[PDB]
From a paper:
Clathrin-mediated endocytosis is essential for protein retrieval during neurotransmission and receptor recycling. Accumulation of the adapter proteins at the plasma membrane initiates the endocytic event and contributes to membrane bending. Complex formation has been observed between the ENTH domain of epsin and the ANTH domain of Sla2, the yeast homolog of human huntingtin interacting protein 1 related (Hip1R). Epsin and the phospholipid PIP2 are essential for clathrin-mediated endocytosis, and we show how assemblies are formed between the ENTH domain of epsin and the ANTH domain of Sla2 in fungi.
The Ent1 and Ent2 ENTH domains (ENTH1 and ENTH2) from S. cerevisiae as well as an ENTH domain of homologous epsin from C. thermophilum bind up to two PIP2 molecules per domain. We tested complex formation between the S. cerevisiae ENTH2 domain and the ANTH domain of Sla2 to verify the assembly relevant to the ENTH2/PIP2 crystal structure. Indeed, an assembly with a stoichiometry of 8:8:24 ± 3 for ENTH2/ANTHSla2/PIP2 is formed, similar to the ENTH1 complex and ENTH/ANTHSla2 complex of C. thermophilum. When equal amounts of S. cerevisiae ENTH1 and ENTH2 are mixed together with ANTHSla2 and measured by native MS, a complex containing equal amounts of ENTH1 and ENTH2 is formed, showing no preference for either isoform and highlighting the possibility to recruit different epsins into a complex with Sla2.
Author numbering: 16 to 147
The structure:
Amino acid sequence: YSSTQVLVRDATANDSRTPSIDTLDDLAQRSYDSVDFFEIMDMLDKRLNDKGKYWRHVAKSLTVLDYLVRFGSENCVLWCRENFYVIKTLREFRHENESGFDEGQIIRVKAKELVSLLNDEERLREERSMNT
């Protein structure tokens, strides 16, 4: 029974837990309600715009977005198309920790893939056709 604010905040929290499928699928289901959608995308917008030490907000928000564009509301797709700039800037996201370790690498990878997916509307439609 968790609120949508708490669910989306926990899913994208700054910690090393990756969002659970349980959580991604509940988000996806909730994305079909216009009020929940507002809440989910509000938080994801904030977190995708984070930088530097808060890279985990980005990485996780990207995972959520990647799941929503396949399993959530068609509005999740339209949102990414409307805010495509945010996603595209993430293909070059950098954060080197003070040990000289690139944490951005996986974000780049995912952002490159999601931009690719978004631009290949026929492939995206095929995937979306398999959702329940």
